[PDB]
């Protein structure tokens, strides 16, 4: 949360800025903190197709 | 060449014109205007 706060305070949400984070960093997909920038990409396990 | 080229242009798109040659007879580029502090054009595009 602090990292995203710093990033969007400096202005790291511009074009071309692609962010890739693992499942531990992003936590749970349903819980979306307000610090999450638009177009944020994460990597996790198959939670939808792999029931 | 330019004379009959412009007459062909006048025949095509129907304009009126005058023709005359330049005084200094020179192309013109960015040069200092009589050892001043200004670099400007001269010649055809200088007066254009």
């Amino acid at each position: 949360t602090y990292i995203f706060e710093v990033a969007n305070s400096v202005g790291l949400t511009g074009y071309g800025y692609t962010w890739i984070v693992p499942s531990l960093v992003a936590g749970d997909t349903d819980t979306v903190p307000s610090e999450f920038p638009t177009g944020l990409i994460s990597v996790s396990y198959d939670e939808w197709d792999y029931g | 060449f330019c004379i009959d080229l412009l007459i062909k242009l006048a025949r095509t798109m129907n304009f009126t014109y005058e023709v005359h040659l330049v005084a200094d007879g020179k192309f013109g580029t960015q040069e200092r205007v009589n050892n001043s502090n200004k670099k400007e054009w001269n010649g055809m595009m200088g007066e254009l």
């Binding site: 400096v10 202005g11 | 960015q30």
Partner: protein, 50 residues
């Protein structure tokens, strides 16, 4: 006028207008402050703005 009067190959990076009457003005200013890479900056302000 003078920088193009001398036709040598200058390089003007950016020109900045600052708004201190708005608190969000500084946050807006941060975007172009991110574009600060030239080692020399020409300043225009008063002392309190300085």
């Amino acid at each position: 006028s003078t920088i193009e009067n001398s036709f040598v190959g200058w390089e003007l990076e950016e020109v900045l207008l600052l708004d201190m009457s708005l608190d969000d003005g500084d946050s807006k200013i941060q975007n172009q402050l991110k574009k600060l890479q030239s080692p020399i900056i020409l300043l225009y302000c008063t002392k309190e703005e300085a």
